[PDB]
Motif scaffolding. Structure first.
Motif, PDB file in Angstrom:
ATOM      1  N   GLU A   1     -12.182  10.190   1.051  1.00 46.35           N
ATOM      2  CA  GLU A   1     -11.448   8.966   1.369  1.00 46.35           C
ATOM      3  C   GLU A   1     -11.889   7.809   0.483  1.00 46.35           C
ATOM      4  O   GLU A   1     -11.069   7.132  -0.137  1.00 46.35           O
ATOM      5  N   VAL A   2     -13.197   7.567   0.449  1.00 45.56           N
ATOM      6  CA  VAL A   2     -13.703   6.414  -0.289  1.00 45.56           C
ATOM      7  C   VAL A   2     -13.430   6.582  -1.777  1.00 45.56           C
ATOM      8  O   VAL A   2     -12.963   5.652  -2.446  1.00 45.56           O
ATOM      9  N   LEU A   5      -9.902   5.895  -2.427  1.00 44.73           N
ATOM     10  CA  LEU A   5      -9.626   4.470  -2.316  1.00 44.73           C
ATOM     11  C   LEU A   5     -10.119   3.720  -3.542  1.00 44.73           C
ATOM     12  O   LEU A   5      -9.475   2.762  -3.987  1.00 44.73           O
ATOM     13  N   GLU A   6     -11.260   4.136  -4.101  1.00 45.53           N
ATOM     14  CA  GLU A   6     -11.702   3.571  -5.375  1.00 45.53           C
ATOM     15  C   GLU A   6     -10.624   3.711  -6.436  1.00 45.53           C
ATOM     16  O   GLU A   6     -10.390   2.788  -7.226  1.00 45.53           O
ATOM     17  N   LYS A   8      -7.235   4.132  -5.997  1.00 51.71           N
ATOM     18  CA  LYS A   8      -6.115   3.247  -5.673  1.00 51.71           C
ATOM     19  C   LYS A   8      -6.430   1.801  -6.028  1.00 51.71           C
ATOM     20  O   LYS A   8      -5.567   1.078  -6.539  1.00 51.71           O
ATOM     21  N   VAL A   9      -7.650   1.352  -5.735  1.00 53.70           N
ATOM     22  CA  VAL A   9      -8.008  -0.033  -6.023  1.00 53.70           C
ATOM     23  C   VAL A   9      -8.043  -0.277  -7.530  1.00 53.70           C
ATOM     24  O   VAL A   9      -7.511  -1.279  -8.021  1.00 53.70           O
ATOM     25  N   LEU A  12      -4.556  -0.562  -8.734  1.00 56.57           N
ATOM     26  CA  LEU A  12      -4.018  -1.871  -8.383  1.00 56.57           C
ATOM     27  C   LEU A  12      -4.540  -2.951  -9.321  1.00 56.57           C
ATOM     28  O   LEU A  12      -3.790  -3.852  -9.711  1.00 56.57           O
ATOM     29  N   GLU A  13      -5.824  -2.896  -9.671  1.00 61.75           N
ATOM     30  CA  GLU A  13      -6.388  -3.890 -10.587  1.00 61.75           C
ATOM     31  C   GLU A  13      -5.641  -3.883 -11.918  1.00 61.75           C
ATOM     32  O   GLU A  13      -5.379  -4.941 -12.491  1.00 61.75           O
TER      33      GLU A  13
ATOM     34  N   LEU C   5     -16.292  -2.271  -2.274  1.00 61.63           N
ATOM     35  CA  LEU C   5     -14.843  -2.125  -2.273  1.00 61.63           C
ATOM     36  C   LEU C   5     -14.182  -3.225  -1.460  1.00 61.63           C
ATOM     37  O   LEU C   5     -13.103  -3.707  -1.824  1.00 61.63           O
ATOM     38  N   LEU C  12      -8.731  -8.930  -5.198  1.00 57.33           N
ATOM     39  CA  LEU C  12      -7.348  -8.591  -5.511  1.00 57.33           C
ATOM     40  C   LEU C  12      -6.377  -9.384  -4.647  1.00 57.33           C
ATOM     41  O   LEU C  12      -5.332  -9.830  -5.134  1.00 57.33           O
TER      42      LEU C  12
END
Lengths: 33, 33, 33
Positions: A1-2, A5-6, A8-9, A12-13, C5, C12
């Motif tokens: 999960e984490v 998520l890293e 996806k973030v 997004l950046e 995160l 963001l």
């Protein structure tokens, strides 16, 4: 999960950076944009 | 924490998508925008 | 990891908020922008 998520973030950046460049170009009229 | 962060990230993705559409419309002059 | 995160996501969110304001100003022509 984490880990996912890293990713996806980070994606997004990148998307936000591209938006910032495009918006600054519109605001300033760079190269006739 | 992680579940709540998943939600924040999903909401950001939606916000970014809407920004991308609006910026592409401004850049291309779609429908007179 | 999770704490870091949280920070990236908060940063963001701030960047996206600023983009939303700038794009709304361009779309609406506020103050001649």
């Amino acid at each position: 999960e984490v880990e996912a998520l890293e990713k996806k973030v980070e994606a997004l950046e990148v998307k936000v950076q591209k938006l910032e460049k495009k918006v600054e170009a519109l605001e300033h009229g760079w190269d006739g944009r």
